[PDB]
Swiss-Prot record, chains A, D:
Modified residues (Methionine sulfoxide): M63
Identification of the protein by name: RANTES(4-68)
Taxonomic lineage: Eukaryota, Metazoa, Chordata, Craniata, Vertebrata
Shown part of the complete sequence: 28 to 91 of 91
Residues glycosylated per entry: S1
Effect of T4A: No effect on inhibition of activity by tick evasin-4
Reported impact of T4A: Reduced inhibition of activity by tick evasin-4
Disulfide bond annotation, renumbered to this chain: C6-C30, C7-C46
Amino acid sequence: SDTTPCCFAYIARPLPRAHIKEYFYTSGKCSNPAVVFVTRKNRQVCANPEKKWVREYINSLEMS
Amino acid sequence: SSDTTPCCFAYIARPLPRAHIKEYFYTSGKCSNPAVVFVTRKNRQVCANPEKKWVREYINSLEMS
Amino acid sequence: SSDTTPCCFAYIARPLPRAHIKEYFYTSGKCSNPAVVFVTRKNRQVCANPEKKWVREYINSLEMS
Amino acid sequence: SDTTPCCFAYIARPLPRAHIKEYFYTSGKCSNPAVVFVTRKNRQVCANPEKKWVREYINSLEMS
Amino acid sequence: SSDTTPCCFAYIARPLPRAHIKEYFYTSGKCSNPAVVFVTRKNRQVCANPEKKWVREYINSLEMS
Amino acid sequence: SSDTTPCCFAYIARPLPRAHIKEYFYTSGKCSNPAVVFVTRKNRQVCANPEKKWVREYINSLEMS
Ligand SMILES: [Cl-]
Ligand SMILES: [Cl-]
């Protein structure tokens, strides 16, 4: 019965890659699929998982 | 600072100990399910059924303080 | 000292308890969706649909003393 | 629901960097993308994310 | 000398209820947009388009009732 | 509640007495002119020139307390 974070819209402009510390996917219970990027200062930004830059960011976060 | 929205997909079964609650809110209308969230003193966010008697009474207790 | 504008992108379904509401406001015409915001005694703010009968009745009750 | 803070205009003049405590990106639900700077005394100022000074302020906050 | 003056940058599309309005004024001609402001019994202020028929009817009623 | 936006069309000529100031804000970017508003203890809203040295120093005083 914990809340889970869901996204209902996406930032259009990519945020700076160097500011991003980690990412996660929102729960599949959520009505929309989403990636959440977490900044060094713990801003959380919803992103569209079908966008090329979101995929490049995730790939970079995971393999470097 | 965060543009995620907390949503609920289950309601807690046992009423929370009243003394552990410090605030409540209603989840956004964007969420698929309507819900009450009770925020505990340890800052757990607990989903609860808005129709339940004990939930309405807790909220009433917090608002009419 | 904020020049952000509070907007609503969804509404709560069930009327919240009348006795908890301290004031309302209409959101700005800048917002893409028209809305009412109810403010509770403890400053929860709840987005509500201006076309719903219960919303219009709550507003009326707050405006007529 | 809860309200979403949106920006419908931006401050032209950069505000003093030393007064700024934090920033956030407005929600993707908003019609106009924006940055909000929050001062030590909780003034909130709408700013244009494409402006260099805005990007540099954000970078300074994230990389500090 | 240098008081602020209220300006409107958008208008409420839905006419607000006529019975809630206690007075109106025009924003300053210095403002970039022309506007009527309706003031409710509870001192809510609502920007309105002075070219709209319902705004004129409201003003006429407020002046000649 | 307040659909209107406070805008400035003139800047006060004489620096306000610092002790009379309670807060400041920057006016909305919607306004045609950029401005600082000092809020006095009596709750007067005074428009002031953002480029003026004394204005920037008052603001700095208020933020850096
Ligand atoms: Cl997108
Ligand atoms: Cl209109």
